[PDB]
Design a binder for this molecule. Sequence first.
Ligand SMILES: [Zn+2]
Ligand SMILES: [Zn+2]
Ligand SMILES: [Zn+2]
Ligand SMILES: [Zn+2]
Ligand SMILES: [Zn+2]
Lengths: 76, 80
Amino acid sequence: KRLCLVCGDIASGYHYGVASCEACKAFFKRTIQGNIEYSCPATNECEITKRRRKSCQACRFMKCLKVGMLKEGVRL
Amino acid sequence: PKRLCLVCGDIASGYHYGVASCEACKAFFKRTIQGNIEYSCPATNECEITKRRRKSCQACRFMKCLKVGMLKEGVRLDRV
DNA sequence: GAGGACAAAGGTGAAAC
DNA sequence: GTTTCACCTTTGTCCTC
Ligand SMILES: [Zn+2]
Ligand SMILES: [Zn+2]
Ligand SMILES: [Zn+2]
Ligand SMILES: [Zn+2]
Ligand SMILES: [Zn+2]
């Protein structure tokens, strides 16, 4: 089953160049559209899992970038 | 269509934790579960819960939330 | 596979307690 | 010092395009 490369939830298909779920798709889209900056309250190593993806916006967004979600896939 | 809070009789803003409820009972239930807060009734666990008296007993207000069907599991452990 | 509508989650802080 | 609640923001679903 296609897994979301960000969080391990079931992927709905490719989004912004990468196998991802609707939740991570929507989160990445909002983050880019608003130029929203987050910062980790731990040390930028928060676990991102389907059951625990909302614990840190900063680490979730960094994981999106890491797995190859593309800023320019989001329309201005 | 106008809907009433099943807990206290205030105007409901929507469904919260599975039940028609106002913003106050939603917030109260959310705080209670997030903190695993235990309350105790000073009377005999039959305090009336109304718009005018929802503040008088945390214990009875929380038990009423459970009674009308508010769901502990609708409160996410996944948060900041 | 892009974005948007939107219910129902979540967070907040002045005022109430 | 802690708790309440009106008014916010964010999340994730499901839909048109
Ligand atoms: Zn399989
Ligand atoms: Zn995901
Ligand atoms: Zn973090
Ligand atoms: Zn209520
Ligand atoms: Zn009581």
